[PDB]
Ligand binder design. Structure first.
Ligand code: MHA
Length: 293
């Protein structure tokens, strides 16, 4: 054994990650007021003399407002019918738009149903990427990036994962209510009788203190994918990052002397996403937003 006479772990913007390698860190913050989305993206170029390919670790963060709304339904005969529009699923995806780039890793890589999601992408010099479905107490990497998000009552699925694109869906699953657990497909999910016959639209639905954050507020994504570039090919590549929602409609009609009658319009508005196009310049190690927003 020779663990005692090993080299030092640390023998010695842009971060030096070891001999002949550095990470050039770029960021883009693109928001849409109309979409209620903020894409806060980190783009880390792995510049390594011992890795025959250029690599870009893309960490997708930011915010997707739930856009949950509670409204009157206009029209005679609908005075006692109210509508709640809410996100059944949050969509996060990255699609490559040029043949000279491919995706070589994705986090989360598998479906995850825990309330807390915390994972790590590690990089070791010479092109070695590794992933762990946990944070802390992992191996020894030259560089690492983590993802962290909470999805109470929702589950994360890999909807699509290939050399050109990755799509995750953070989908409604099971909710705690004062009347017991309810499935995301229960048509009575979130409805309630208002306090009186003149009760506002908001009163026909579960109060804020009963709605989990992905329904009441929104989602704070935290996802990773690494783009691989075959050297010799074009210095530039384009790709799109999409953040959005699939919305359901819940209708609640009050029959004052009887109670509530509920209806669900499932998948009422699908793939309602904010798409941003970016261009990687592998030569200058730069990112620019195409068209912007
Ligand atoms: N915007 C679209 O065309 C996509 N979707 C829209 C939606 O269902 O909300 C329908 C489809 O094309 O199947």
């Amino acid at each position: 054994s020779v663990g005692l006479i090993a080299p030092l772990a640390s023998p010695i913007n842009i971060e030096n990650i070891g001999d002949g390698a550095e990470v050039i860190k770029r960021t883009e913050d693109v928001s849409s007021k109309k979409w209620g989305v903020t894409q806060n993206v980190q783009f880390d170029f792995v510049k390594d003399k011992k890795y025959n390919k250029d690599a870009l670790i893309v960490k997708m963060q930011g915010f997707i407002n739930s856009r949950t709304s509670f409204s009157d339904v206009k029209g005679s005969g609908y005075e006692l019918t109210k509508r709640m529009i809410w996100p059944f699923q949050y969509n996060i995806g990255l699609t490559t738009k040029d043949p000279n780039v491919s995706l070589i890793n994705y986090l989360p890589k598998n479906k995850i149903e825990t309330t807390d999601v915390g994972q790590t992408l590690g990089y070791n010099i010479g092109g070695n990427f590794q992933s762990a479905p946990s944070i802390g107490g992992n191996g020894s990497f030259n560089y690492s990036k983590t993802i962290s998000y909470t999805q109470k009552s929702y589950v994360s699925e890999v909807d699509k994962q290939n050399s050109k694109s990755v799509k995750w869906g953070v989908k409604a699953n099971e909710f705690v209510t004062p009347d017991g657990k309810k499935s995301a497909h229960d048509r009575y999910l979130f409805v309630q009788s208002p306090n009186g016959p003149t009760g506002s639209a908001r009163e026909y639905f579960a109060p804020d203190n009963q709605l989990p954050p992905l329904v009441q507020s929104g989602f704070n994504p935290s996802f990773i994918t690494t783009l691989s570039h075959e050297k010799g090919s074009s210095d530039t590549s384009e790709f799109e990052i999409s953040y959005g929602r699939n919305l359901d409609i819940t209708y609640a009609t009050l029959f004052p002397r009887t109670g509530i009658y509920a209806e669900r319009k499932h998948n009422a508005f699908v793939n309602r996403n904010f798409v941003v196009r970016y261009e990687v310049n592998w030569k200058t190690h730069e990112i620019k937003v195409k068209g912007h927003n």
